Amino acid sequence: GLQEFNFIVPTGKTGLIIGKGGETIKSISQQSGARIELQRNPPPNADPNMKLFTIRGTPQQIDYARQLIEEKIGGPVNPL
């Protein structure tokens, strides 16, 4: 059963999740079993200083991916 978790971070922290090369987001997706989607075309009322992410998986996969992302950015994500 697949579910979704939406969160935001400041645009400047996106690197810490992606990694030099895109190695970090690939490694978190592989270890967790979840997909990690960066919003491609934000609507015009979206804050340009914030970036939306969506974790897609089973709840167990989503929880694990969220904990790995939180280690990298050094604190909790902002949930929507």
Numbering used by the authors: 375 to 454
Reproduce passages from the article:
Far upstream element (FUSE) binding protein 1 (FUBP1 or FBP1) is a multifunctional single-stranded DNA- (ssDNA) and RNA-binding protein, which acts as a master regulator of diverse cellular processes including transcription, mRNA stability and translation as well as RNA splicing. Central to its single-stranded nucleic acid (ssNA) interacting function of human FUBP1 is a tandem of four K homology (KH) motifs, namely KH1, KH2, KH3 and KH4, which is embedded in the middle region in between the self-regulatory and transactivation domains at the N- and C- termini, respectively. Comparison of the four structures showed that they all adopted an evolutionarily conserved eukaryotic KH-domain architecture, consisting of a three-stranded β-sheet packed on one side by three helices.
In contrast to the upper part of the binding pocket, considerable variations of the amino acid compositions within α1 and the β2-β3 connecting loop led to the remarkably distinct properties of the nucleotide binding pocket at the lower half, which is responsible for interacting with ssDNA nucleobases. For instance, a longer loop together with the presence of small hydrophobic (A194 and A197) or polar residues (T385 and T388) in α1 of KH2 and 4, respectively, resulted in relatively open binding surface with strong positively-charged electrostatic potentials. In contrast, the migration patterns of KH2 and KH4 were rather ambiguous with some slight shifts observed for nearly all nucleotides, except fragment 4 and 10 that had a high GC-rich content. In addition, we observed interestingly also that KH2 preferred the T-rich fragment 7 over the TGTG-core fragment 8, which was in contrast to KH4 that showed no preference for both ssDNA. As expected, in contrast to the wild type, all mutants did not show a shift in migration on native gels upon incubation with the selected ssDNA.
